[PDB]
Design an enzyme around this catalytic site. Structure first.
Site, PDB file in Angstrom:
ATOM      1  CB  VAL I  85      -0.959   0.012   1.207  1.00  0.00           C
ATOM      2  CG1 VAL I  85      -1.859   1.231   1.148  1.00  0.00           C
ATOM      3  CG2 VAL I  85      -1.785  -1.279   1.232  1.00  0.00           C
ATOM      4  CE  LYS I  86       4.637   4.090  -5.038  1.00  0.00           C
ATOM      5  NZ  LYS I  86       4.864   4.954  -6.243  1.00  0.00           N
ATOM      6  CB  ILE I  87       0.675   5.665   2.909  1.00  0.00           C
ATOM      7  CG1 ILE I  87      -0.154   4.387   3.092  1.00  0.00           C
ATOM      8  CG2 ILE I  87       0.232   6.807   3.821  1.00  0.00           C
ATOM      9  CD1 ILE I  87      -1.616   4.595   2.882  1.00  0.00           C
TER      10      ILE I  87
END
Lengths: 223, 223, 221, 223, 223, 223, 223, 218, 221
Positions: I85-87
């Site tokens: 997950v890119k945050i």
């Protein structure tokens, strides 16, 4: 690197803790004096900080004399397990640190301005030393060089005392501390806030949003 | 880094030890004689120091020949298991160090002025080697460079002899010794006292005190 | 590099001058008042030093106010052409230096502890600036590093103010000053007298005499 | 750093060892040809130099061919387990070292003048390699730089061959060897003596004597 | 190095000028906005600054368009010979600088954040470039490194444009600028004040006073 | 540092020149052909650039043999005294450069990939040498290092050939070229446009504008 | 940096010069002994190589003694004013150079292998000194370091003797010579040819040809 | 540092093996083609080298396609446990190295000219990577710099692939390889022999001989 | 050093995977929306990439609020175990990373432009941090210097967060990353395809074939 908040302002502390990026708090008699106004008592402020912060909280003795320092230090220690007794770099201060260390009370030696002061505090058995980089900057000397020397000295003798960079004024104090390998920085709230920010982060997020709207007008990611 | 006092004054010793930053003591016939006044016996002064100091006390042999040095060193050792025998860097001194090292009598090779002299003393089994940095400075050679080379040589060969920086004249000899990683410095009581001081420490403590009075009129910390 | 003698002791000054290696003298209120005891007056000490020394002689004002500083400076100047007025690094001091420089009175800005103070003194037109290296050493900072920075800054801007290294405590302050390229050092007498000496010089002289006697039993050429 | 004596002159070992700073001895055909005159035989020479030494004695073959070198090496060996056979850096030399190393005979490869020759000798299993720093100095090349490269190379590969600095001409070859971290230096007995001397040492002893006479006009420390 | 005061506050300017240590003034639209309150007009503020400062006074155009910039620049120039027209680093800005330089009107290119922006402004013929070191610090990049690069680039091409370090926050920005060799720094008043001060200066003066009182109780120097 | 455009578009040229940061133009048959549309004659485009640009315009010869190169170069030179003939680093190209240099026809040696190629072109008398930094980057070699070596070589011998950095791909090629001290960079119009931009410039200008409106509602500067 | 051709083979000067990158020629007894076979005489050889060259041709004496060297040198000279006489670095060689230099005959001191030999030849007045970098490489010494030291030494004393790098084996000897700032390199004709080549150059030309064919299917630039 | 001999000449290998300072041998199609003349078959040349040489022997596949590479490789391997299969730095080559590594067949990736190529080969599991320093020198770039970078990259990632310095032209390539810490060098025969030589060694042997004659006229 | 492919282009991903040198993929909202056109849905593109790629696949949340970020993150995670997950580096982002790390969901903190932002992301427990070097180059700052500082900082504190160099524009970003010791680089397809190639490799292969034919006219072994 641990990041402490350098303040006695309860709102700042609550806020920073909830960002999840604060590992402790440092106070000093000036910081507390700023908050203990308009009927607010210093005793209440100190207890509340200890209450709401999980990590180390430094509280400074005000006595200048050995016996007064140890008396007040034991009181501070008694307030909670996370309390750390700030003790100034003075003759009586070193004596107090030696005693308090033998009593297993965590200590923080403050008002440190050169590397040999830091070493002396470490020899007395202090848990943290807190050199004041901004106040060295104030007098025309690059304060970060003192942090570099302390790091080298401590590394040389495998000293376990933690280097806690204090009197931080800007994000470059923070960056240089991290590059040097200081154990902890303690920063004012306005500095804390700034560490997260960068114009290209803002710009990048706006662009991602704009591009995504082309594929999803409502801007949602439905998976 | 260990810190020794060049002194024979028990009051100074007691005070420095209480500060938690003195690890032993270095003496000589002059330092001891100084104190032998108002009924004080030269011999009692040395035996009192040996008894009170948990760590090391260096005492110099005066004989210049091997047999005299070892007989004298044995008499010195007999006065306390913490007595360290100071022997000069000479052909007979090296022979004495080798013999004494086999008898497990601790030694300190003094009047060392270059790194190879220091290495030879370490090869003879000496406990400490004492280069005289201030006396090099006196003749227009930066004495601390010799300490730096000795640290590198000793590190190369995992030599267990301790580097004891002597003829110290100022707090920068001390600073540089710590940054280099010398094992020990020996300093006069007043050089020692100067090591804790900085004008920003004084000013900072004064401002803290003033600010605290604003919230606690009697200057107390009631917790 | 010029070498000045840092003292108000007349006997030290006569001795150093006779050696031929003293290019000037620096005094300060502490050094003068040390000598001005048991009957000796400071005005007499100051005049005597001016007479004995051919080179520059620094004498410090005591007023903290601009007006007092310039008045005292003019009197100091009036005592002899070799007199150099020491003025402390303060706001009033910088004003006084600027005025005195315009009146062609040589000045020496003292109690300088960092390179920016030194630059301010130069911008005011000061003849010498005197950073105190030993007092920096006293508080755990390598004073010579400040001299190195001041030399670089002065080089960058082609500054004509002379760097006068003061509060010198040992011959390595002197050596480092020379390697850096400071214009002047001022040294206490005990340090001064050590600069010519080396044990290998003594040993070499002895050997040379010894060998020469084998040629001339009487020891002459 | 081990220190060997590099001469064939018996007058110039007992006393070095008594100082506790001699670990062994080396020689060579020249140095042997110097003492094998006026009725003294080289056989006698080499013998007088094995039994007494709790360390290594290097003895050089004279044969230039493989079979001869190895034959000689066995004879040399036979005289004692601590005998070390000196073999020049040649094609046949490398062959002989490999064979002798497999026979657990200790070897010393001499006439080394660059770092790759040293590596080759190490690869053949040599116990010591001996670069001739002084002879490099003679031809306008700083010989100590070769020792520095050999040290680096040997460190890279965890090579167990000991660097034995030879053709030493002055105390600065010795100092630099120690700073670099060479395993051994071999020096003439006299260079050896010079290593302990410094005029400030002499001066210091005279000062100590003068001041002891004040404390105790007799000249002896009675304890 | 020239030292400008970075402010539009008339009292600060009068004060700094009279210290004799101020060689000019920089303003910008924010600084002026701060002063142009409670009936005070920006036109009056700008004229008064030009009036009382002898050195260069930078006043920024507010138009974002080429024609507006040159119109306003000529008006600023007309106010006095010491006026310097601040022009932002933008496409229209560079065009304006080229025109104004050909008209012999002094210019200062502002809002510069990297060395190539500075070079472009210099190529357009600008009199000063003003990189904002503190705002680079704000975003986690050491702003002084950009000054170092600009100094190198300008030195390379013998560029006569002056480097004017701006957005200065502390005395170490000033020190590093001087060491690099920047032409000018512009500093806020509080920073300006701090540059003169040092604890050891204060301490030294107090000691001289105390010692002198011993020789002259009234504290005067009567010559 | 001079800045050339890799382009044949007069609109771009005019704009860049108006910014005051374009010192000449580099072309090739493709760049020119690009513009030869909607009635545009290939030849008119090249002659229009020559006439309008006060400085240099590089045009490549297509012949691969000496005689063809010189005849073509002469025809190129005939089109404008500011035309510069681009000739590749080949045996025949070097011969052509030497001949043309004697006829005082300016030249640009292209397809240079190492510093010795650059030196040979300078020895033939070439006006500019064009190393292709991006094409070195393409093959896993840092192209700017070749520029650095060429600057040092040219400086060593006071060579008057100008270093024209080509195959530029990003603003760091430009930055590094300036810090090294290359004489010229040639860049596409869009790389050129990017060189002026920085997000802190945009944000700063926006804040200045906002603050100015507080004191001048219509956003004007009336002086 | 001047570039000479180092061969005695006539097939391998006109074309080098035509490229504009050849400043002269050198040879030696070996290289001569290579072409003086199958009916060709060395006399013929050396002659064919003086008249046509607008530069220097080095010709080596064969005599090992002073009178012979100088006699030979005069003969060599007589053939032309641009003839340069090659004299080895020997006692008699230095004598001959001093004499010839006083007679305004140009000299080239060969067989130089360290920087002090180079200095000696310069002091005798030699026009060129020729260190053999490749032969130093052969014996495990980086020959280019000697050129670097000679450059530094010659710069220190404003020495006018030209450093002529000889025994070149590869293009990196050439590159390093240029970076160091050697006055001359002498290389074989083939090494010379390799110096202009790079695979990205070849690739680039092919690309240019391909794309030109698109602009103008014919293959020629008509202007 | 291991030292291999870089030739296909049986005489040189034999002479160098007889020195006992050789730890292995590398060949390549060029060097094989040199000796595969006057009726000599390449197959004979290889079995021979393999037999005489104890250490690793690198033999290069000639196919350019993955499948031809792994079949070639498997047959090279069959010839002796000391065989190391030399595979070029190409898309198919990397794939072949991956397959061969998993089959526990040692590999040597050749024609490497920059550090990222060397890293890709290491990521494929290659046993050795062989950068060609002399061929870099040839085109005006200092080849040894590439070895320096590969040593750092391999150190960073604890990479077990051995750096095999190839296209060696002189003893300074060798010295620098040792100072950098390359795992292996492979050297042409004329270079190998020169590595033991130095004029002061010769002069030294002579003087010792001369002086020894004084002590024993033998 | 791992090498990831920075794209949402399925054809580029299949091609790179088939080459055997792609260890993972990074996407972002711009890259995905570039592909999600003329009928293609982003949910299909994201699923397809997850299926094709064995290694880690970074997919970015779009919510700017903590709650939205964690909800979207859990859905991304649910799509396959290789999903990362890119945050973004924001206050809400750091909170989300801390929560997701506690739930053992791998995370990648993006839009990082200085070393202190990277340290904050590591302190929050992030699996990868992705500084954008080319975008720093774009604004006149050498982006690789930030990678070097982050490597030093991470080394100092034995930080286990992986440094994932992003916004890569050329093979020298890749080379410098390897020399510095970054854990991962993510590269656009055009850069990826250049990494194996060198003109001397091509030339050497040609020469080797040429010489081998003199041995076997048919060109086999």
């Amino acid at each position: 690197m641990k990041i402490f908040l350098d303040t006695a302002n309860i709102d700042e502390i609550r806020t920073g803790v909830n960002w999840g990026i604060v590992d402790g708090v440092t106070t000093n008699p000036t910081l507390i004096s700023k908050e203990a106004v308009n009927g607010k008592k210093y005793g209440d402020i100190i207890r509340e900080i200890l209450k709401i912060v999980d990590g180390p909280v430094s509280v400074e003795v005000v006595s200048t004399k050995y016996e007064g320092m140890v008396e007040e230090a034991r009181k501070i220690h008694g307030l909670g397990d996370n309390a750390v007794v700030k003790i100034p770099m003075t003759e009586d201060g070193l004596r107090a640190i030696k005693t308090l260390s033998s009593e297993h009370i965590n200590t923080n030696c403050t008002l440190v301005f050169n590397p040999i002061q830091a070493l002396l505090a470490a020899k007395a058995g202090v848990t943290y030393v807190s050199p004041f980089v901004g106040r060295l900057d104030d007098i025309g000397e690059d304060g970060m060089q003192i942090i570099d020397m302390i790091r080298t000295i401590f590394n040389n003798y495998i000293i376990k005392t933690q280097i806690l960079v204090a009197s931080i004024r800007n994000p470059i104090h923070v960056l240089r501390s991290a590059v040097i390998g200081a154990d902890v920085v303690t920063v004012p709230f306005n500095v804390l806030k700034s560490l997260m920010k960068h114009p290209k982060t803002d710009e990048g997020l706006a662009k991602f949003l704009e591009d995504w709207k082309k594929v999803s007008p409502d801007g949602k990611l439905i998976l």
